[PDB]
Amino acid sequence: APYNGNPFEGVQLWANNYYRSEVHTLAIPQITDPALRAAASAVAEVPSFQWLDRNVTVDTLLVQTLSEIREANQAGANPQYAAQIVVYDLPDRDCAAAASNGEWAIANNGVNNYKAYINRIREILISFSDVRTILVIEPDSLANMVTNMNVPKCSGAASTYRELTIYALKQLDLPHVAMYMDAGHAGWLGWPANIQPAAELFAKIYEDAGKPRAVRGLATNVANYNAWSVSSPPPYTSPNPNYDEKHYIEAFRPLLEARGFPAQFIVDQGRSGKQPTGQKEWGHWCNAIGTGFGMRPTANTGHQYVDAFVWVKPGGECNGTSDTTAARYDYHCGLEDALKPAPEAGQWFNEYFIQLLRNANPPF
């Protein structure tokens, strides 16, 4: 069914069974403290995004989640449930990273692979038109075109990133869908030197895709730890005047809007409840210590440019291994402020889940 306006209005957000199963089968059996067990049970009910970060998730997880939401809705959920999905499988993924877990390469049929993936997602979303579906498009993609064009892999991938982003925006432009393109975070694109070039890029992409109706705007702070709004700059932010997501968005939106894209925002707060964090530097993104579960997902943001506070990166799923000998080891995961020992990316990291619970704000 179609919708008008903020896609988070008029619906409840579904808490998916993948994250719920992680908490109940992997986390809780390792927790003996009664209060931490009850807190863990509560966090399993908080609705976070489900990531299509490997092709095999499309005909498994996506179908299962949509099917379960349809069942719940037909069983009288009121308001009806909506889905929250991340599209995250560009070829030559994460072009500026030390290592990437992306499965596809431009040199090994990756363009065709990606187009087919988007096409299959489109078929499934059409099947499940009755389930309003909110998408984050490709974290750690186009932000690289703003600041990392000096990196050979990024320069070589840029036309592909742009073309395939446009492809997804047009193919997924369906009446029951909303899309938010990833736009980095305050400590990446929010630096004053980067903010106008970033606005130029995202507004051009939006134009070149034909300003698809389903595109609501941009997502920020995905898989990062930034504050929404704090009174004092965390020490690792200096001297960026845009030291939280509110400052970033308030500076960013006017530049985007003058360029034709009056973007609304969603802001990840799933690991933002403790401020400042235990990061020693802003660019230390992997399994950062001293972080907490943050404000609960809601459409009631109170801010004119923010459609929702969300939990995009699910807390407890590892950002990368601390094993320096692993094939896809990223040195960020070995830093002094990265919790260790850490399993492979995507594996449940229970010590990190417990950290998030202990530092949760609001508490569980």
User: By the criterion CB under 6 A, which residues form the site for ligand NAG?
Assistant: 55, 58-59, 113, 116, 120
Q: How far is the CB of 85 from ligand NAG (least distance, A)?
A: 14
221 within 8 A of 237, measured Cβ to Cβ = no
Q: Return the closest-CA partner of residue 329 out of 318, 316, 313, 314.
A: 318
Spell out the residues 6+ positions from residue 114 whose beta carbon is closer than 8 angstroms to its own: 89, 90, 91, 104, 164, 167
Q: By C-beta, is 42 or 111 nearer to ligand NAG?
A: 111
Q: How far is the CB of 175 from ligand NAG (least distance, A)?
A: 23
Q: How far is the CB of 120 from ligand NAG (least distance, A)?
A: 5
Q: How far is the CB of 53 from ligand NAG (least distance, A)?
A: 13
Encoded tokens for 339: 């919790």
Q: By C-beta, is 61 or 145 nearer to ligand NAG?
A: 61
Encoded tokens for 353: 């889940």
Q: How far is the CB of 19 from ligand NAG (least distance, A)?
A: 22
Query: If you search the block for the tokens 């980067």, which residue do you land on?
Result: 194
Q: By C-beta, is 113 or 155 nearer to ligand NAG?
A: 113
Cα–Cα distance between 26 and 109 in angstroms, integer? Answer: 36
Q: How far is the CB of 113 from ligand NAG (least distance, A)?
A: 4
Cα–Cα distance between 24 and 160 in angstroms, integer? Answer: 40
Spell out the residues 6+ positions from residue 126 whose beta carbon is closer than 8 angstroms to its own: 174
Task: Tell me if the bond preceding 2 is cis, omega within 30° of 0.
Answer: no
Q: By C-beta, is 9 or 123 nearer to ligand NAG?
A: 123
Q: By C-beta, is 127 or 232 nearer to ligand NAG?
A: 127
Cα 311 to chain centroid distance, Å, stands at 8
Q: By C-beta, is 15 or 58 nearer to ligand NAG?
A: 58
Encoded tokens for 74: 């037909």
Cα 94 to chain centroid distance, Å, stands at 14
